[PDB]
Amino acid sequence: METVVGLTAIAVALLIGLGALGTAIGFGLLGGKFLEGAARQPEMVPMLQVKMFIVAGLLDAVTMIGVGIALFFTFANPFVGQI
């Protein structure tokens, strides 16, 4: 058990950590274009905002599937049941 349980804490840290790394760089690239678009067209700000939040759903989908399987490995364990 000690290895299957200790290598599940490393599994959890990579599922949430690699997702935390990619979402902070992805929203910083997406947001950098939203703030310039908001300057080039001050009257388009309400349209640019609703379109940015549509992209945000695509940007975080795989990251959020990983914060769920990581929480599922932290309070339940599909590997410990296999001895």
Binding site: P46, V50, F53, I54, G57, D60, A61, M64, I65, V67
Partner: protein
């Protein structure tokens, strides 16, 4: 007591459920609370969420049951600045006639802000006042309701029901499955559209299920990590030293000055994603 025991006690909820013999009793230990299954209730979460929601609507009703339509009194001037702010936020995103979207956004913003604000009061005050009023010295009691994943999941799974509802109510059952299987990729050839249904379903279904989870866990993560830092800074004062109980005050002050910005911002993001996700369920965005 030890620092580990002080931290272990602050992370347990007031649970009530099916004991080994009877459906009427509070758990006295964390294990006795984990034995209680899905058919249990956190009485501190439901006691803080319901009490703060009724205080908000009662105060907003006092300024609606006697609205002047002329020169406003101090109370109604504030309530109208909030309704005007929410209505403007809804009109810059939603163009339809739905009467539910605007009061929902006001309810979501003001309630989440109040459930988050109780984190600023000192962390041992309410837990000890509950123990002194009850006569116990081992009573579990958590004040900040948005630090419980069940409370934040309840708020998003309910917004998700309204998204699946309005999507079927205006696009029809055919339009709901159509956006879920004929969008974003469509083709005239019958063999091609059938081979594109699994690809369209993977793309659209994943994004739909991620909406409620991301709304609940963004709120839970910012509040649970926010209170953990206050509990950890309180252990610096538990040491009893002088040059540590002086550094702790600076960290607590700096963290509270930072946390009031986070508490205000998290309520605004939850409101804006509720407005955006309900508005994109009323039109074909593709």
């Amino acid at each position: 007591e030890t620092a580990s025991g002080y931290i272990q006690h602050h992370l347990q909820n007031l649970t009530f459920g099916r004991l080994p013999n009877g459906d009427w009793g509070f758990a006295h230990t964390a294990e006795q609370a984990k034995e209680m299954g899905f058919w249990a209730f956190h009485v501190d979460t439901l006691g803080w969420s319901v009490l703060l929601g009724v205080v908000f609507l009662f105060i907003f009703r006092l300024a609606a049951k006697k609205a002047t339509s002329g020169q406003p009194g101090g109370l109604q001037n504030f309530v109208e600045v909030m309704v005007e702010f929410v209505d403007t936020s809804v009109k810059d995103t939603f163009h339809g006639r739905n009467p539910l979207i605007a009061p929902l956004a006001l309810t979501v913003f003001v309630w989440i802000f109040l459930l988050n604000l109780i984190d600023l009061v000192p962390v041992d005050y309410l837990p000890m006042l509950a123990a002194k009023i009850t006569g116990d010295e081992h009573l579990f009691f958590r004040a900040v309701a948005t630090t419980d994943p069940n409370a934040t999941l309840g708020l998003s799974i309910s917004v998700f029901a309204l998204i699946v509802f309005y999507s079927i109510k205006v696009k029809g059952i055919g339009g709901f499955l159509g956006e879920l299987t004929l969008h974003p990729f469509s083709s005239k050839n019958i063999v091609v559209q059938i081979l594109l249904i699994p690809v369209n379903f993977l793309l659209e279904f994943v994004t739909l299920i991620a909406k409620p989870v991301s709304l609940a866990l963004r709120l839970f993560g910012n509040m649970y990590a926010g209170e953990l830092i206050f509990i950890l800074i309180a252990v610096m004062f538990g040491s009893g030293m002088f040059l540590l109980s002086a550094l702790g005050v600076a960290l607590n002050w700096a963290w509270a000055v930072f946390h009031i910005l986070i508490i205000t911002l998290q309520a605004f993001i939850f409101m804006m994603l509720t407005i955006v996700y309900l508005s994109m369920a009323h039109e074909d965005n593709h």
